[PDB]
Amino acid sequence: KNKCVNFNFNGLTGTGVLTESNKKFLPFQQFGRDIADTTDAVRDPQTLEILDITPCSFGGVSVITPGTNTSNQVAVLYQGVNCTEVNVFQTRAGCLIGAEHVNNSYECDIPIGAGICASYQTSQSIIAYTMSLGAENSVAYSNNSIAIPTNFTISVTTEILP
Amino acid sequence: ALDPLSETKCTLKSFTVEKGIYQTSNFRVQPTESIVRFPNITNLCPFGE
Amino acid sequence: VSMTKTSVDCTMYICGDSTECSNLLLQYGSFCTQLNRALTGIAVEQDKNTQEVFAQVKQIYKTPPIKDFGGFNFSQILPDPSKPSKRSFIEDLLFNKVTDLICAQKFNGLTVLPPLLTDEMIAQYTSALLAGTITSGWTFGAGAALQIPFAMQMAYRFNGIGVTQNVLYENQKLIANQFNSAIGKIQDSLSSTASALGKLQDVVNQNAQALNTLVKQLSSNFGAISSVLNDILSRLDPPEAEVQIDRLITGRLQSLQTYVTQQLIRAAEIRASANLAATKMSECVLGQSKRVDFCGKGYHLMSFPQSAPHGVVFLHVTY
Amino acid sequence: IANQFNSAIGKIQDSLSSTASALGKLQDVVNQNAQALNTLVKQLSSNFGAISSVLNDILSRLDPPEAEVQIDRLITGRLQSLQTYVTQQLIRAAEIRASANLAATKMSECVLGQSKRVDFCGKGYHLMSFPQSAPHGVVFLHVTYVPAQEKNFTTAPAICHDGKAHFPREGVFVSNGTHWFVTQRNFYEPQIITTDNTFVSGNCDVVIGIVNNTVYDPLQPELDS
């Protein structure tokens, strides 16, 4: 139990994490099924018990690296899974290896997820940080105060559409 | 398959990897060992008959 | 605005934990690779909708410590820092009235990707747009923010719709009883009526139905003797199993292609609505638009955006 | 305005010449089509369940009744490949037409005429737009009026002179701490408060925050002269 194994139970072959189940099947019931009809839990034919089956091997593998002209450093991102195999850190997207965690917020460069972005900065290495939402601007407000522009500038914006 | 960088090169089919995040492959969890639980039957089937 | 980010693996979906089934899948070429890249693009586009809609500004606009609005109560639209997640009282209802299930999908092979922009950061964007509308008026979206008293801002908003500014100061007392009473009706309507947000619930329901169908097709045999790969491999001869594996891969490949096709269609429907929202963010919210019934019935005065799950809500003040 | 524009256009030339990724929106079209066309061709080499991808090998090997089975697998898959290609092209065809319609809208509003829409023609107050030719697309140069510097002044909703509140006909009231001036919202151009620049409505006991001042009457010195 508590490990991913290849199991054969009463002729049922498969792979999954085996853990003790809190569900109580009726005396005549053996194998359970979830909303997807896949096996939720089984009844051990030798020593009767209800055993939960959690599928294994979930999550993706992503590579976070700057441009080649920048450096060859790489930060592996394991999606939808915490740190297991194993700068080994955890994020809301999953286990992130190869990136330092900087509490200071910066402008998003390489997006990761859940408001987390990575960048190559200062002896430079990949770092992880919370996406900065922009500089804080406190607008002065008073009933008798007003701001009249004293100067202007002509700007040229470039827009492209296919 | 050498390091994560090389995997990105074949993923892009190019030796120039641009700044960004790129998905390589999935996360595979292999089973620890084979488990076998069967009922206890000591009787032989009368196939001779 | 945003739709659920989903990433399906054509290798595991079609062939579960099977070496033979996976080998026969190679004979179909890049179809697998293409079906994964198509869904990847969708998830990327779903995040673009948040950048082109929710965040209209590069700066954070904060309210003054001493807030004098001239007799109006904005406490409903403004965020409350005492809450665990910063949100306005109205956004509180918008979050609760819109609806583990995803855990079962994770075990079924369906990857749920987290959004790039968190809900808390979405509340900060609106909070900044709301703070700017009050203090900066119409000038924060067109350039450097200019300080104007909110009382005089409406005087300009009335002149733009054809109402002489001299109606404000005399009836401003009644203009407050109408607005403050109007905002109270918004809170009562959103709290009492839970179906007003069904537009957003349809997005969640649509994805739920598409994901449920995607999983239920795996149980079908698709004409094969059995839908389980381990069964046909433990029974039929090597050449006989390949015959059955062909039927299972063929159908599972078609079912996945149908899923990707439908997701691309819905991706075109959300991107169309996201553009409509972005257009309203600039015309109705940031500035003042003279368009007829674009910002809502009546002459448009001001619009206050509000954060809602997988979307955006607009409160349009009209004359 | 002549120096700012010419200097601005000079920055567009340097930005376009230095930055080659500004047109990446157009390069994505070429890359997308190139990927779809390449993928469409690579499917011909796939077996699609058949013994071999070559049509002559199967026809020249298996018997007439046996070959039809294997050839059918190639036809079925290759048929599915076209359905996949056409399906994707129809989807992308709906995306390009959306951008083309957006451009057509900008040509009428931003280029031909002057648009009052907010941030449709680009940041600032839109003046004019100059189109430019680009491969499989358009390029818009949007000349806008952006205010630069501002200065905080004291304002009041009304002026009280003869007992009736005086209001601005255009602009707003502003003062540096000495005299009250009339000015436009987009720029600071001192103007004396006068009956020609203001109108009379209500009284001084209604407006909250009204200030007392002398409203210049152009007829007073003329009648006295």
Side-chain angles (χ1 to χ4, degrees):
Chain A
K1 294 176 179 177
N2 291 337
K3 294 177 179 177
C4 183
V5 295
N6 186 339
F7 59 88
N8 186 339
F9 295 157
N10 192 30
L12 177 63
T13 301
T15 300
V17 176
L18 298 175
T19 59
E20 183 178 2
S21 179
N22 290 337
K23 294 176 179 177
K24 294 176 179 177
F25 300 168
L26 296 174
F28 60 90
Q29 293 176 334
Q30 295 178 335
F31 298 162
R33 294 183 181 277
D34 62 9
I35 296 169
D37 292 344
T38 60
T39 300
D40 181 67
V42 294
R43 185 182 295 276
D44 183 3
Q46 184 63 57
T47 300
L48 297 174
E49 62 185 342
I50 306 304
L51 179 63
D52 185 4
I53 295 170
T54 300
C56 304
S57 298
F58 177 80
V61 177
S62 296
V63 176
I64 295 169
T65 188
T68 301
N69 291 336
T70 301
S71 63
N72 290 337
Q73 294 299 321
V74 296
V76 176
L77 177 63
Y78 297 139
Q79 294 177 336
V81 63
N82 63 345
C83 300
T84 60
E85 294 177 350
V86 298
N87 290 336
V88 177
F89 296 154
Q90 294 177 336
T91 60
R92 293 182 181 175
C95 184
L96 177 62
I97 296 170
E100 183 178 2
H101 187 279
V102 176
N103 291 336
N104 291 336
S105 296
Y106 297 139
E107 183 178 2
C108 185
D109 291 344
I110 296 170
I112 295 170
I116 296 170
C117 297
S119 179
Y120 177 77
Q121 295 299 321
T122 301
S123 63
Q124 293 177 335
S125 63
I126 295 169
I127 60 173
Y129 60 88
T130 300
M131 176 177 72
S132 178
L133 296 174
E136 294 178 350
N137 186 340
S138 178
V139 177
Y141 176 78
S142 178
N143 291 336
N144 291 337
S145 296
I146 187 168
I148 304 301
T150 60
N151 188 340
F152 59 88
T153 187
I154 304 301
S155 296
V156 177
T157 300
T158 301
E159 294 178 350
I160 298 99
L161 295 175
Chain B
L2 178 63
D3 60 353
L5 177 62
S6 64
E7 294 176 350
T8 301
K9 293 176 178 177
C10 293
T11 301
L12 296 174
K13 294 176 179 177
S14 178
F15 297 162
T16 301
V17 177
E18 294 178 350
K19 182 178 180 180
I21 185 170
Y22 297 136
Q23 186 174 355
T24 300
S25 63
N26 62 345
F27 178 79
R28 179 60 179 166
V29 176
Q30 294 177 336
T32 300
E33 62 184 343
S34 178
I35 303 301
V36 176
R37 298 286 289 173
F38 294 160
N40 186 340
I41 297 169
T42 60
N43 291 336
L44 296 173
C45 296
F47 296 160
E49 294 177 351
Chain C
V1 176
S2 178
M3 291 177 70
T4 301
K5 292 165 62 180
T6 300
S7 178
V8 178
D9 185 3
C10 52
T11 301
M12 295 299 294
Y13 176 80
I14 295 170
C15 297
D17 291 344
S18 178
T19 300
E20 296 301 321
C21 185
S22 63
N23 290 336
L24 276 65
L25 178 63
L26 296 174
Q27 293 177 335
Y28 295 137
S30 63
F31 296 160
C32 188
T33 300
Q34 294 299 321
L35 295 173
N36 290 337
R37 294 182 182 175
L39 296 174
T40 300
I42 295 170
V44 176
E45 295 300 321
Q46 294 176 337
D47 291 344
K48 292 176 178 176
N49 291 337
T50 61
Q51 294 177 336
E52 294 177 350
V53 176
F54 296 161
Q56 294 299 321
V57 295
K58 294 176 179 177
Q59 293 178 336
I60 296 169
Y61 297 139
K62 292 165 62 180
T63 59
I66 296 169
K67 292 188 294 184
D68 184 3
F69 298 157
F72 299 166
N73 186 340
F74 297 160
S75 64
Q76 295 299 321
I77 60 172
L78 296 174
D80 184 3
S82 64
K83 302 299 183 181
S85 178
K86 183 178 179 180
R87 65 185 182 277
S88 64
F89 297 161
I90 295 170
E91 291 175 350
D92 181 67
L93 296 173
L94 297 174
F95 297 161
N96 291 337
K97 301 298 182 181
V98 176
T99 60
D100 291 344
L101 296 174
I102 60 173
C103 183
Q105 294 178 336
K106 293 176 179 177
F107 297 161
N108 290 337
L110 297 174
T111 300
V112 176
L113 296 174
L116 177 62
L117 178 63
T118 60
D119 291 344
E120 294 178 350
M121 293 177 182
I122 295 169
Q124 186 63 59
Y125 295 140
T126 59
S127 296
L129 296 174
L130 295 173
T133 301
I134 297 166
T135 60
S136 296
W138 60 93
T139 59
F140 63 88
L146 297 173
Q147 184 173 356
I148 296 171
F150 178 82
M152 294 177 182
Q153 295 177 337
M154 294 177 70
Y156 176 78
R157 294 182 181 277
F158 295 163
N159 291 337
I161 61 172
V163 176
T164 304
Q165 63 180 19
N166 62 348
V167 176
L168 175 62
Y169 67 90
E170 183 178 2
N171 290 336
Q172 64 182 19
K173 294 177 179 177
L174 296 174
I175 294 170
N177 291 336
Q178 293 177 336
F179 177 83
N180 290 337
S181 63
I183 302 300
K185 294 176 179 177
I186 303 301
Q187 186 174 355
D188 291 344
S189 296
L190 296 174
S191 178
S192 296
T193 300
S195 63
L197 296 175
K199 179 62 174 173
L200 296 174
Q201 294 178 336
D202 291 344
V203 176
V204 176
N205 291 336
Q206 185 63 59
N207 291 336
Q209 294 177 336
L211 295 173
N212 290 337
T213 300
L214 178 63
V215 176
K216 293 176 179 177
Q217 294 300 321
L218 294 173
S219 64
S220 178
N221 62 345
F222 297 157
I225 295 170
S226 178
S227 64
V228 177
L229 295 174
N230 290 337
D231 290 344
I232 60 173
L233 295 173
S234 63
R235 295 176 63 185
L236 296 174
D237 290 342
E240 293 177 350
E242 294 177 350
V243 176
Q244 295 300 321
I245 294 169
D246 290 343
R247 294 182 181 175
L248 296 174
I249 296 171
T250 300
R252 293 182 182 175
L253 177 62
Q254 293 177 336
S255 64
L256 178 62
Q257 186 174 355
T258 300
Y259 176 77
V260 176
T261 300
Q262 294 178 336
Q263 294 299 321
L264 294 172
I265 295 170
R266 297 294 181 190
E269 294 178 350
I270 190 67
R271 291 174 296 180
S273 63
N275 291 336
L276 177 62
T279 302
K280 292 177 179 178
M281 293 298 293
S282 296
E283 294 179 351
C284 298
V285 175
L286 295 177
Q288 186 174 356
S289 178
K290 294 176 179 177
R291 296 176 63 184
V292 176
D293 291 344
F294 177 80
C295 298
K297 183 178 179 180
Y299 296 138
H300 182 61
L301 295 174
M302 68 193 86
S303 178
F304 297 159
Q306 295 300 321
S307 297
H310 299 290
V312 63
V313 177
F314 298 159
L315 296 174
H316 299 289
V317 177
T318 60
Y319 176 79
Chain D
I1 295 169
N3 291 336
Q4 293 178 336
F5 177 82
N6 290 337
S7 296
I9 303 301
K11 294 176 179 177
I12 303 301
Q13 186 175 356
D14 291 344
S15 296
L16 177 62
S17 178
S18 296
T19 300
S21 63
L23 296 175
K25 179 62 174 172
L26 296 174
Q27 294 178 336
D28 291 344
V29 176
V30 176
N31 290 337
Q32 185 63 59
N33 290 336
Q35 185 64 59
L37 297 174
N38 290 337
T39 300
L40 177 63
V41 175
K42 293 176 179 177
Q43 294 300 322
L44 294 173
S45 64
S46 295
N47 290 336
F48 296 157
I51 295 169
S52 178
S53 63
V54 177
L55 296 173
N56 291 336
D57 291 344
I58 294 169
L59 295 174
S60 63
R61 180 182 294 177
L62 296 174
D63 291 344
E66 294 178 350
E68 294 177 350
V69 176
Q70 296 299 321
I71 302 300
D72 181 67
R73 294 182 181 175
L74 295 173
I75 296 170
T76 300
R78 292 181 182 175
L79 177 63
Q80 185 174 355
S81 179
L82 293 172
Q83 294 177 336
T84 300
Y85 176 78
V86 175
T87 299
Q88 293 178 336
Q89 294 299 321
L90 294 173
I91 295 169
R92 298 294 181 190
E95 294 177 350
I96 189 67
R97 295 175 64 185
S99 63
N101 291 337
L102 177 62
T105 301
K106 291 177 178 178
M107 293 298 294
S108 178
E109 295 178 352
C110 299
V111 175
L112 295 176
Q114 186 174 356
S115 179
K116 293 176 179 177
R117 296 177 64 184
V118 178
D119 291 344
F120 177 81
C121 298
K123 183 178 179 180
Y125 297 137
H126 182 61
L127 296 173
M128 68 192 86
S129 178
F130 296 160
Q132 294 300 319
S133 297
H136 300 290
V138 294
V139 176
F140 299 160
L141 296 173
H142 300 289
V143 177
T144 61
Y145 176 79
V146 176
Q149 295 299 321
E150 68 285 5
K151 184 177 178 181
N152 291 336
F153 295 153
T154 302
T155 186
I159 303 300
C160 185
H161 181 61
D162 61 354
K164 294 176 179 177
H166 300 289
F167 301 154
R169 292 181 182 175
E170 185 179 3
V172 295
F173 295 159
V174 296
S175 178
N176 62 345
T178 60
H179 189 279
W180 292 92
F181 296 159
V182 176
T183 187
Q184 297 300 322
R185 294 178 178 83
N186 291 283
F187 59 88
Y188 177 73
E189 183 178 2
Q191 293 177 336
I192 303 301
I193 295 169
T194 187
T195 60
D196 291 344
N197 290 337
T198 59
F199 59 90
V200 177
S201 178
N203 63 34
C204 297
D205 291 344
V206 175
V207 176
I208 295 171
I210 185 167
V211 296
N212 187 339
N213 191 341
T214 300
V215 176
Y216 176 78
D217 185 3
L219 296 174
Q220 185 64 59
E222 294 177 350
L223 295 173
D224 291 344
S225 178

